[PDB]
Design a protein around this ligand. Structure first.
Ligand SMILES: [Mn+2]
Ligand SMILES: [Zn+2]
Length: 516
């Protein structure tokens, strides 16, 4: 079998980091994870980038005797990891249904004979053709599940092939598991641990704050002209412009090229050699801009992308966070610019509400609502993101469009106490609409049947508009005082941070709600 490379495991982690991978020091959370994995304890890793993430299982794999198995759905990216690893002297291979059976059998023979240390496998392949019975004889020492949020229906990218990964724990009870992801909120993180059967795992959630990325929004008004001007104002800085159609990509690349800008189109309709060339030309800074569909995702992630534009709003914050997160991997100042029109959200809502009714549509609706609320926020954009992912923070960043031009404020302490009290009084079971009706004292049969018309809070906000109360509550959500529980039909629920305001111990400044 693949042999451990270092005598002392504790000192080995840093030795391999530096000597094999060339990194001088660990990033936050990495050492902890790696030492925990080397101790044989299950782990869930929520990390800012794939880069720090992958070393969380590659370093352990080099310090252990045995085979490390890495499950990933990214076939054309898994194959790239292998080449890069092999170039660093690491015995890596991959197995998936796209390979010929001849090639698959060679990889299986490499694992059987102990010539392969690290095997990347597609989830479908791992659970097919009695592969697990073969895997049991190959001295498995660690099983890592990448893109682990894909096992959850509460996430933004559920994959049916991940569901069967819940059978691994039972089949390999003494095999330590790790689950890894860059984008999972609280509900999704909890679901990952439950579905994979992680045994009291170390849960390492790194910060979602990328302090060097400035987040901005521009309301659309002749948006093709706004986009060209934005690009002109970058004055040569590199960028990715994300569009939701191939024609937008192609037309946008042509208009930029017409103005002397070094830009290329990138989408799944290009040939593989053309895709690789565009990626390489962008990596080396031969190209200033790549205009792309969501296909030009992570994977290339040049460290020095200066800006990411979203011409069209994404369907969920998870996607928006992942895509904007491709900017400024080097830590130098970077910007994310989203062009928005409320008619864009109206269209997405239309598309969604005629899809099949039920649980799946509810999940999509919840995440779409939150994306629209981010766009229409009156609170620091960074706080919206951080609190969406459950990273409690109330201090404004000073580095987003809202922080650069804060809305007029008012003392919202009384309004916040009314909203927070209402949420508590209705036992945190109801969504935004119902709560606002209770506050405004509406004539509603449902309210009377629950007896909520007898509450003291009932009608305490009747003198302020529906949109006023929606804004108050949305700002409380964006500040992390209130959450929307996706597993309870988006019920409004209270956090620990709500306590001082609810008690009247602290004052709360809020944005005066926009008239709209
Ligand atoms: Mn250590
Ligand atoms: Zn801010």
């Amino acid at each position: 079998m693949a042999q451990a490379e270092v005598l002392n495991l504790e000192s080995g982690a840093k030795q391999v980091l530096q000597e094999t991978f060339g990194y001088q020091q660990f990033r936050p959370g990495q050492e902890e994870i790696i030492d925990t994995v080397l101790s044989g304890r299950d782990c869930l890793v929520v990390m800012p980038t794939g880069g720090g993430k992958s070393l969380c299982y590659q370093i352990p794999a080099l310090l252990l005797n045995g085979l490390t198995v890495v499950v990933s759905p990214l076939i054309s990216l898994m194959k790239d990891q292998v080449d890069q690893l092999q170039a660093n002297g690491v015995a890596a291979a991959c197995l998936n249904s796209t390979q010929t059976r001849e090639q698959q059998l060679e990889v299986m023979t490499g694992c059987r004979t102990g010539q392969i240390r690290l095997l990347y496998i597609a989830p479908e392949r791992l659970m097919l053709d009695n592969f697990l019975e073969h895997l049991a004889h190959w001295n498995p020492v660690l099983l890592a599940v990448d893109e682990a949020h894909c096992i959850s229906q509460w996430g933004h990218d559920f994959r049916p092939e991940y569901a069967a990964l819940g059978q691994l724990r039972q089949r390999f009870p003494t095999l330590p598991f790790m689950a890894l992801t860059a984008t999972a909120d609280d509900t999704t993180r909890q679901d990952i641990v439950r579905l994979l059967g992680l045994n009291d795992p170390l849960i390492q959630i790194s910060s979602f704050d990328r302090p060097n990325i400035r987040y901005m929004l521009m309301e659309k008004f002749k948006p093709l002209d706004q986009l060209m001007r934005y690009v002109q104002e970058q004055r040569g800085k590199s960028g990715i412009i994300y569009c939701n159609s191939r024609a937008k990509v192609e037309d946008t690349a042509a208009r930029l090229q017409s103005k002397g800008i070094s830009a290329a189109a990138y989408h799944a309709g290009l040939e593989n050699n053309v895709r690789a060339d565009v990626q390489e030309k962008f990596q080396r800074d031969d190209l200033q801009i790549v205009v792309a569909t969501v296909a030009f995702g992570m994977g290339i992630n040049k460290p020095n992308v200066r800006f990411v534009v979203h011409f069209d709003i994404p369907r969920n914050i998870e996607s928006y966070y992942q895509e904007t997160g491709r900017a400024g991997r080097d830590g130098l100042p970077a910007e994310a610019m989203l062009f928005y029109d409320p008619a864009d959200m109206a269209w997405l809502r239309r598309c969604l509400e005629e899809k099949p009714q039920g649980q799946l549509q509810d999940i999509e609706r919840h995440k779409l609502n939150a994306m629209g609320a981010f766009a229409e926020a009156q609170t620091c954009r960074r706080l919206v993101l951080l609190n969406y992912f459950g990273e409690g923070r109330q201090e404004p960043c000073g580095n987003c469009d809202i922080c650069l031009d804060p809305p007029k404020q008012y003392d919202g302490s009384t309004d916040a106490q009314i909203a927070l009290s209402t949420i508590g009084r209705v036992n945190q079971r109801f969504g935004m609409g119902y709560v606002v009706e209770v506050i405004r004292g509406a004539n509603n049969q449902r309210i009377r049947d629950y007896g909520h018309d007898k509450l003291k809070v009932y009608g305490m906000g009747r003198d302020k508009s529906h949109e006023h109360w929606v804004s108050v509550i949305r700002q409380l959500i964006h500040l992390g005082l209130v959450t929307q529980n996706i597993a309870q039909h988006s019920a409004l629920q209270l956090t620990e941070a709500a306590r001082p305001v609810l008690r009247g111990e602290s004052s709360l400044q809020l944005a005066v709600p926009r008239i709209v």
